Structure 1
Amino acid sequence: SSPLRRVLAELNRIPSSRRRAARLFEWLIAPMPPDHFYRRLWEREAVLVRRQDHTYYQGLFSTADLDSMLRNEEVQFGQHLDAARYRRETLNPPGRALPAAAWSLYQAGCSLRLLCPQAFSTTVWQFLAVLQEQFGSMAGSNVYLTPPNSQGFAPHYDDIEAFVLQLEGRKLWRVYRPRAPTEELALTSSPNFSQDDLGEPVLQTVLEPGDLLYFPRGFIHQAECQDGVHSLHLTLSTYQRNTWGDFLEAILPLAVQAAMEENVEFRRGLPRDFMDYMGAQHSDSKDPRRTAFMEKVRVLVARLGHFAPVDAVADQRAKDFIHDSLPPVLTDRERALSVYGLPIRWEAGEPVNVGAQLTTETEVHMLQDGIARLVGEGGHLFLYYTVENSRVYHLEEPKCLEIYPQQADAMELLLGSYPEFVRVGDLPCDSVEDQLSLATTLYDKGLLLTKMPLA
């Protein structure tokens, strides 16, 4: 047993994918309640959870897992594994990362960074796939392996929300509040800093297996070796470029374009002579045409809010989130009740069970709650889905299927009413054949499950 294997068996038994995302996150920070965490701590404060349980994460990832993937899997330096010694010197021999070369670099003082553990570990995959569903943002991970008595990286801050889960050994972390207003919730990663750049840490602790450390983007952090032992931790990262400003970036051009098409005031010609009083050379001119020009800009910018296509941009963001998502991890029930667990197979020179079909009696809901998004584009409707994504980020292009207007209302019904079962024959389409057709298309793609297995 282990608290991790225990929460996973529980996850396997929770019917809603939405609820199992909430449960897993609750586990991640236990005993702190998530509502308190998100309202008071998320994006505001560094958080230490002292677990008092070295066993908490057992089974998530281990140095033994890393050793195994080095030999059994096609781990490449640069692409998958960084080896670094500390200024920062990257000792990446080009090519395959063999145990021989990796472990040799480690004995010589290099830290090992696995860039994509979810690509090679079914457990990390499941972990990130369920968690992405309650962030609404891609969730990545790196695993870090630090040898005994090695110098630590320079202090710096990142552009993502970080959760560090201490897996093996011990490490002394120092984290710092943003040092100036500009660095609070920073837009981009920092350069490396000198000790003399830093204030006092807001948080300093020796992390032990099972512990958790969270800090927002813009919080400087630094870590060093302890007690003559090694260190392994997994870092979980989210909220890359998931800002009110990023939403605004997409909204604005569309809003100006809408205001122009729909309001004459936006289509009126500039003054013939605004170049006489606007421009850097005129920055302290006391010309009242300049004051009037400025006001008119502010008035029009302000009115643009009425023209903001918020819903269409929400949908484009949802489309990109689908494209960024890890593919889903099916429960045993979900598998059994879907195309994936359907007993059609080759058996003694022939297939068996071919012909199993949906009927109007079949009861139906989406496989999971975070696998699909209906998006209207250039007059047409497309259901984008995650079920064919690779465990490698953007390895695949975005996948969709066209949803026809006769079946649009049924689709929104399915998306809106998970995990409630609905009869195929109760789907709001104009025809029986449109009901079956939508149901079959979705089931075949792996987007749907049936209340009982087919035939």
Structure 2
Amino acid sequence: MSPLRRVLAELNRIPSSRRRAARLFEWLIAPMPPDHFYRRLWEREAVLVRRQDHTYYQGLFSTADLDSMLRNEEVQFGQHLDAARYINGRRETLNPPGRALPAAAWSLYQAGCSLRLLCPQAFSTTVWQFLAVLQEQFGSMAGSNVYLTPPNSQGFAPHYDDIEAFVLQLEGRKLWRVYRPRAPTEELALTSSPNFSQDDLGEPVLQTVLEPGDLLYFPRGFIHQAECQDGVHSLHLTLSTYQRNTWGDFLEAILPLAVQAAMEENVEFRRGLPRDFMDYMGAQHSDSKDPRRTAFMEKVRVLVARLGHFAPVDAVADQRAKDFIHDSLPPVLTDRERALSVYGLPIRWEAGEPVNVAQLTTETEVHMLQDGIARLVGEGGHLFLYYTVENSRVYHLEEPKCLEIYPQQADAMELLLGSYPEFVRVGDLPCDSVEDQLSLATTLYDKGLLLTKMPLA
């Protein structure tokens, strides 16, 4: 048995979804320790992990699974699969219209075209499981792409991305070349770059041949390019995360709300501008010596600084959590979680008709299904519980899902969300009455958000 199915089997025996996420990441970069990685390497340097084990990722994804997908599923060119080549320093795209049947795909492959699968998780349960778990410890959507390159070729031109990449060599070997950010403004880039030329590139800060099992990491801003060696093809999966998840993004949402609050709460933000600032402010006056200009600029600077006092940091943090819930992949349940949830509730048929399949009582111990599937949020004064359980495996196919939380249950809801994975008697929930104590537990159980100590039926 490969280390991968062996860790997956282990994962099925780990109760805490949070701990599972930590465990899988640990596995992903073994033997390097997580704390060292996140504190010194993350968003700072390209890292390589030679695992001396060609069977490490075995079971995650193979060229055979790709072939099986194109044949079994409705794979579409462009939307799901791309065909590209990089010859004579030029990037080419031979994407045919419509479905990508095996016959067309392999014909392009033979023609030296690389094949790129955009959303493996939408078609592979293993890949879905992998990403679904890792997203919980990234605190950001974790996506993926699969790349298959023919012998003696290069599918894509050199460039850097707007996300943190994790390259998992799955089959064959390939020569990688990773460069350190060329200039200060490219460090931790916000957007993807245009295809670069070999001349515009400097000296590789890292150049090696990856083999099955190896892991290659590098933050956004680092240019990279790879090519297959002679007579051997390459297949690898790239895990990506942290797209537009910066302090700047956080501020972009904070500021508008801050100025509005400042104007409503403090009269100094409501006072009129001078009647003649147009005489010394503006491009025409960029070289003015009018002392009023200096005073004007100093006032803008202080007012801007004073905005931090009016910044609804918690609200914006909740809004980002909400969006994260929407971007999240649906959860992967363990045998236990499923068996102890509505998803494992059996249905008994008596005389052809379903005979009461089961019901929650005040003597039932429960706790959230998993740790990263729901988030309480305030909007318009009311509370709403946003969750991932109904999300599709395909990015944003489903709209935000939520269920309103009434004030007489707000505390009980926070407890459950904050006490995971501690079993709490439903009768011990902090509510007004027993009714609100059981209606909450039932609603949450029915949606598949809560699990019980022992099966109800």
Q: Could you say which TM-score interval applies, normalised by the shorter chain?
A: over 0.9
The superposition leaves residues 121-170 of structure 1 with CA deviations (integer Å, 9 ceiling, x where unpaired) of 00000000000000000000000000111134221100000000000000
Question: Which runs of structure 2 are paired with 1:277-292 in the superposition (5 Å)?
Answer: 277-292=280-295
State the match for 1:426 in structure 2: 428
* 1:376–1:299 Cα change, 3 Å: same
* 1:109–1:397 Cα change, 3 Å: same
Give the deviation of 1:398 after TM superposition: 0.4
- After alignment, is 357-366 or 191-200 more displaced? 191-200
State the match for 1:50 in structure 2: 50
Contact 1:157/1:220 (8 A) holds in 2: yes
Distance, in Å, in 1 between the alignment partners of 2:155 and 2:209 is 14
Corresponding residue to 1:149 among 145, 152, 157: 152
Give the deviation of 1:345 after TM superposition: 5.0
The superposition leaves residues 298-338 of structure 1 with CA deviations (integer Å, 9 ceiling, x where unpaired) of 00001111111000000000000000000000000000000
Contact 2:157/2:225 (8 A) holds in 1: yes
Aligned to 1:195, the other structure's residue is in SS state coil
Distance, in Å, in 2 between the alignment partners of 1:33 and 1:100 is 44
Contact 1:343/1:353 (8 A) holds in 2: no
TM-score (norm 1): 0.99
Distance, in Å, in 2 between the alignment partners of 1:366 and 1:29 is 29
Give the deviation of 1:228 after TM superposition: 1.7
Contact 1:364/1:422 (8 A) holds in 2: yes
The superposition leaves residues 374-395 of structure 1 with CA deviations (integer Å, 9 ceiling, x where unpaired) of 0000111000000000000000
Give the deviation of 1:260 after TM superposition: 0.7
The superposition leaves residues 261-299 of structure 1 with CA deviations (integer Å, 9 ceiling, x where unpaired) of 111110111001111110000001000110000000000
Give the deviation of 1:196 after TM superposition: 1.2
- After alignment, is 383-392 or 149-158 more displaced? 149-158
Taking every aligned residue pair, what percent have the same amino acid on both sides? Answer: 100
Question: Which runs of structure 2 are paired with 1:229-308 in the superposition (5 Å)?
Answer: 229-308=232-311
- After alignment, is 423-432 or 87-96 more displaced? 87-96
Contact 2:114/2:155 (8 A) holds in 1: no
Give the deviation of 1:344 after TM superposition: 2.1
State the match for 1:29 in structure 2: 29
State the match for 2:74 in structure 1: 74
Contact 1:383/1:400 (8 A) holds in 2: yes
State the match for 2:417 in structure 1: 415
Contact 1:42/1:216 (8 A) holds in 2: yes
TM-score (norm 2): 0.98
Which structure 2 residue ranges, 5 or more long, are not aligned?
A: none
Contact 2:423/2:453 (8 A) holds in 1: yes
Matched residue pairs, number? 453
The superposition leaves residues 78-101 of structure 1 with CA deviations (integer Å, 9 ceiling, x where unpaired) of 110001122111111111111111
* 1:245–1:449 Cα change, 3 Å: same
Aligned to 2:4, the other structure's residue is in SS state helix
Aligned to 1:196, the other structure's residue is in SS state coil
Aligned to 2:76, the other structure's residue is in SS state coil
Contact 1:152/1:222 (8 A) holds in 2: no
Aligned to 2:367, the other structure's residue is in SS state strand
Distance, in Å, in 2 between the alignment partners of 1:219 and 1:347 is 64
Question: Which runs of structure 2 are paired with 1:23-422 in the superposition (5 Å)?
Answer: 23-86=23-86, 87-346=90-349, 349-354=352-357, 356-422=358-424
Contact 1:133/1:370 (8 A) holds in 2: yes
Contact 1:372/1:385 (8 A) holds in 2: yes
The superposition leaves residues 188-211 of structure 1 with CA deviations (integer Å, 9 ceiling, x where unpaired) of 111111111111111111000000
Contact 2:84/2:156 (8 A) holds in 1: no
Give the deviation of 1:227 after TM superposition: 3.1
* 1:404–1:95 Cα change, 3 Å: same
- After alignment, is 341-350 or 292-301 more displaced? 341-350
* 1:345–1:274 Cα change, 3 Å: farther
Distance, in Å, in 1 between the alignment partners of 2:78 and 2:350 is 44
Distance, in Å, in 2 between the alignment partners of 1:312 and 1:407 is 20
Give the deviation of 1:350 after TM superposition: 1.7
* 1:205–1:339 Cα change, 3 Å: same
Aligned to 1:84, the other structure's residue is in SS state strand
Contact 2:337/2:369 (8 A) holds in 1: yes
Contact 2:114/2:154 (8 A) holds in 1: no
* 1:347–1:151 Cα change, 3 Å: farther
* 1:346–1:67 Cα change, 3 Å: farther
Q: Please tell me the root mean square deviation across aligned C-alpha atoms, in Å.
A: 0.9
State the match for 1:443 in structure 2: 445
Contact 2:84/2:155 (8 A) holds in 1: no
Contact 2:84/2:115 (8 A) holds in 1: yes
Give the deviation of 1:348 after TM superposition: 5.8
Which structure 1 residue ranges, 5 or more long, are not aligned?
A: none
The superposition leaves residues 382-430 of structure 1 with CA deviations (integer Å, 9 ceiling, x where unpaired) of 0000000000000000000000001100000000000000000000001
Give the deviation of 1:225 after TM superposition: 1.1
The superposition leaves residues 229-271 of structure 1 with CA deviations (integer Å, 9 ceiling, x where unpaired) of 1000000000000000000000000000111111111011100
The superposition leaves residues 11-62 of structure 1 with CA deviations (integer Å, 9 ceiling, x where unpaired) of 0000000000000000000000000000000000000000100000000000
Contact 1:170/1:227 (8 A) holds in 2: no
Aligned to 2:315, the other structure's residue is in SS state helix
Give the deviation of 1:112 after TM superposition: 0.4
